[model samples]
Target chain A: MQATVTEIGKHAIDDSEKMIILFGETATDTLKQHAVIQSFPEKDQVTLAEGDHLKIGDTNYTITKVGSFANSNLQSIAHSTLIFADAPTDEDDVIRNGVYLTPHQLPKITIGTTIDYLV
Target chain B: WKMQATVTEIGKHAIDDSEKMIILFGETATDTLKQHAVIQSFPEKDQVTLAEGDHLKIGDTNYTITKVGSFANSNLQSIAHSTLIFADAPTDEDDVIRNGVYLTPHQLPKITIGTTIDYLV
Candidate 1:
């Protein structure tokens, strides 16, 4: 899917203390509130891969994962919502798939960030 | 939701394409979320004008067609996938929507590619 970043905001978790993650807010707000996640079947199995880059404001961030626990439509609903997480560093952590990311300190992933996939 | 059509085409939307509207094809290989499409509606009329609050059904669900347009995919190519927006994303097993066109997981069983999405007009 294709879309432009329209806003920058935070999402609330149902029972978590910290906000889930930063979402490249959408034009209509709330849809795929986070960066579009996961792959689309086989044809697009590797759309957003690790190492992909996005320019938020004047800063740049590397996509650490393509996990979408939220929604699809990467371009539309998800847009440039930079998705990251506080992944457990335990090597034995079974949840260590390339789907989650660690929150970073980078000028607060803001608006006007352009997101692109490895495709 | 009360419109029906044989999904003639399906594809994704283009990223950074000049056009912001989703195009549902009556057709492929494009970045889209309601980007563009090419549909051959039954009752087969010549160009139908869609309005807000329009309702269509697919897979036991009533999808409200929230938007329509004259542009094709983001590249301004095929008029097939014009644009279709919904109040909420579809969740009918293999159903994936783009440009208003509902795409089944292509080769998946039950709702394979070419399955007909009955939109409640």
Candidate 2:
């Protein structure tokens, strides 16, 4: 699956949470301030699974956990939160809308960056 | 093969209700690490490499191992520092510190000083 980033939120990379919320181009202004808007209107029906590779811009990470709702939300709405952690941390899995990755470092994502999900 | 160890100390937040994990470390662990660990005596011999379907018994409760991370055995044998997750699988891949033994049915076991932890193959 592939998507291109169209806009980056002002507060998207400001915190130590090591996470980035993704949304399609139709996101509200408030959400865009805290999310990475992508050009995807209808995403491919590819389910994110464990052991998958996720590339954001120039950084690559391994997917560790694909929350129960992650694939469905992304396929239907092009929305999901990507969390960087070695293991799922407390509260991170509660919402079940996150796809956890390894290395625990946020990727360098910006407008025009390409996001790829590879098996 | 099987290995057993007795918990010597419980960190201040080792059993914190919010974290569904239990970090174990031997005596050589630094004080900072110990603050978040369940201290155990060093094992005389290295433990057998664990795998899915193995069992981990804490006190009187038994948990079935669902997934074994890449570094779980090496770290557990070398430094006795293993992060045991009360879940079916780990959240991250390639993270040595966060990768360890995943147990089910997804509940943190009650632990205390003197609790006997046994790993059975």
Candidate 3:
């Protein structure tokens, strides 16, 4: 599945959270402040698995952890929090609606960037 | 901190012998979920939060908790629903998804209808 970034939020990369929010066009203005607005997928949503590869712009990341609600939330609202990190170390480190990736580093995304989920 | 519960029902397919996983649910579980769950009840308290390094005592065996999911505590506190994984860390895709508690030594303990389950600090 693939999506194209339409707009980049001003504060999307401001913090040290090492995460970037992906939301569809229907996202609220407040949420868009820290989100990377993207177009909905052209095909059916694929259930993201752990071994799947996620490509953001020119960078590629290997998925390490897929949250319980990540797939459902992404399919329903086109919302997902992609976190660049290894396995969680504590309870608070877990994100129920997020996807964790390895080689922890925020990808450089711009408006027109392409995000692809490859099996 | 300490919390205890008594196993009231054991599902026919509750124990994932291959993965060393066991699902636990409280009395509030739905009929379908109860079929694949080890039903238990927290008689004294209705809420509890578990952390790393806690010991999960089941029957006569004790498993040390290596990692605790963010939702595992709230889910256990509210509905007594939580997945227990017998591993030091999540190694499978399914294990990562549930956000369940990870226990060390990767062994499934013998549990019966009246088995006592306890969480100790």
RMSD of 1: 14.2
TM-score of 2: 0.48
Best by lDDT: 3
Q: Please, what are the lDDT tens digits per residue for candidate 3 over residues A12-96?
A: 6744777777766543343456678888665246688798888998899999887775776566546677888776877555676
Checking candidate 3 for backbone clashes, the offending pairs are: none
lDDT of 1 at A35: 30
Interface RMSD (Å), every candidate: 11.3, 19.0, 15.1
What lDDT, from 0 to 1, does candidate 1 have? 0.34
Ranking by lDDT: 3, 2, 1
Per-residue lDDT for B25-104 in model 3, tens only?
A: 66643333455778897764355778888898998899998887766765565446677888666555454624377887
**Residue range B23-99, candidate 1, lDDT tens digits:** 33331212222332333334322234444455444434454444433221221122223333423434552333333
* Candidate 3, lDDT over the whole model: 0.73
- List candidate 2 stretches off by more than 4 Å: A1-119, B90-98
Q: Which 10-residue window of candidate 2 chain A scores lowest in summed lDDT? A: A23-32
Query: Worst lDDT window (10 residues) for model 1 chain B?
Result: B103-112
Candidate 1: tens digits of C-alpha lDDT, residues A1-119:
32234443343222233222332221222223323222222322335556565443454556565533212323322322233455445644312113333345433333444433333
Native-to-model Cα distance after best TM-score fit, residue B22 in candidate 2, in Å: 0.7
